[PDB]
């Protein structure tokens, strides 16, 4: 078992170094000096361990990096977001940084395109969401707003009536 977690750590380091190209199990075991980890461990790793992981990318007869076998498009699904009856996906910034590239380079363009940052899940965490249109009045908003939240205080079918009369 522990050698498979060393392989997943090496493959995670390969994406952090800049690469998602597929390799054979041999090329992985050679670089990590696990080539002699034992033929029984190599066979189990090949025919059960890289088979029991549903997140492994199988491509070119080989195995590649690593948490996503699909939808590694490294940009937001704007097209789904266009559809206000089905638009839905904000996630965690950590998955998006994990996916491909640092946020900042993409974000400079995105701060004036689609992205909104919310400090959610905690101060150390950020959630990204897509944005919107204009407001419904130019006022100090918050002063007026705090007075106009309003009338949760009963006899309200009668306060609609009282206004109507």
């Amino acid at each position: 078992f522990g050698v498979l977690a060393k392989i997943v750590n090496y493959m995670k380091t390969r994406h952090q170094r800049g690469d998602t190209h597929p390799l054979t199990l041999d090329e992985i075991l050679d670089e990590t000096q696990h080539l002699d980890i034992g033929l029984k461990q190599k066979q189990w790793l090949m025919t059960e361990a890289l088979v029991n992981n549903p997140k492994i990318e199988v491509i070119d007869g080989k195995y590649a990096f690593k948490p996503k076998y699909n939808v590694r498009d490294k940009k937001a699904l704007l097209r789904l977001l266009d559809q206000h009856d089905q638009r839905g996906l904000g996630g965690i910034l950590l998955e998006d940084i994990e996916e491909a590239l640092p946020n900042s380079q993409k974000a400079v363009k995105a701060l004036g395109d689609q992205i909104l940052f919310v400090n959610r899940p905690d101060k150390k965490k950020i959630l990204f969401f897509n944005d919107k249109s204009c407001q419904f009045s130019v006022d100090e908003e918050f002063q007026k707003l705090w007075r106009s939240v309003t009338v949760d205080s009963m006899d309200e079918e009668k306060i609609e009536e009282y206004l109507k009369r």
């Binding site: 638009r87 959610r120 969401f129 919107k132 009045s137 006022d139 106009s148 949760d152």
Partner: protein
């Protein structure tokens, strides 16, 4: 009721923060979804979402179904009042609060009206004498409409009326679809 859904979306935008608006969007569909579904799709924190839900429930925008299993849905029309209540609030600022006839004594900084003049006067000096600290009074203008500082707000109201005009018009067209 697409126009009403837009109309609701506009009024909350002017009012509420984006955190509430984001919860509100899945809700606009008036679907029989629960907090778990809104938690799953939106990824809001359970405590934080529930706070927003508590703000919305308290706001009366929501009605629920308890099976316990709990389900949440909109009442959506509590909106006409929301506009009408907010306008009222805006009207309190619009309704006369100038309190015409109005002096104040610079020493004690207290406030006074026309009614207090007939007692705050003193004939031997031919001028106004305050009640206790005895000093001249020279107009009021305290917490009252004045030169530009308050008037920026009265103008704000002047500015608010055109921005909710289309929404009232939205309310008017909605009054036509009511038959429907």
């Amino acid at each position: 009721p697409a126009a009403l859904k837009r109309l609701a979306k506009y009024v909350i935008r002017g009012f509420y923060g984006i955190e509430h608006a984001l919860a509100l969007d899945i809700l606009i569909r008036n679907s029989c979804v629960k907090e778990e579904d809104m938690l799953e799709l939106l990824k809001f924190d359970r405590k934080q979402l529930r706070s927003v839900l508590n703000n919305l429930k308290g706001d009366k925008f929501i009605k629920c179904r308890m099976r316990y299993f709990i389900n949440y849905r909109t009442l959506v029309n509590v909106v006409k009042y929301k506009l009408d209540h907010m306008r009222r609030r805006i009207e309190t600022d619009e309704r006369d609060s100038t309190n015409r006839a109005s002096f104040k004594c610079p020493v004690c900084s207290s406030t006074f009206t026309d009614l207090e003049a007939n007692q705050l006067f003193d004939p031997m000096t031919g001028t106004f004498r305050c009640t206790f600290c005895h000093t001249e009074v020279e107009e009021d203008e305290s917490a009252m409409p004045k030169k530009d500082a308050r008037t920026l707000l009265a103008r704000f109201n002047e500015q608010i009326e055109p921005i909710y005009a289309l929404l009232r018009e939205t309310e008017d067209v909605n009054l036509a679809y009511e038959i429907l």
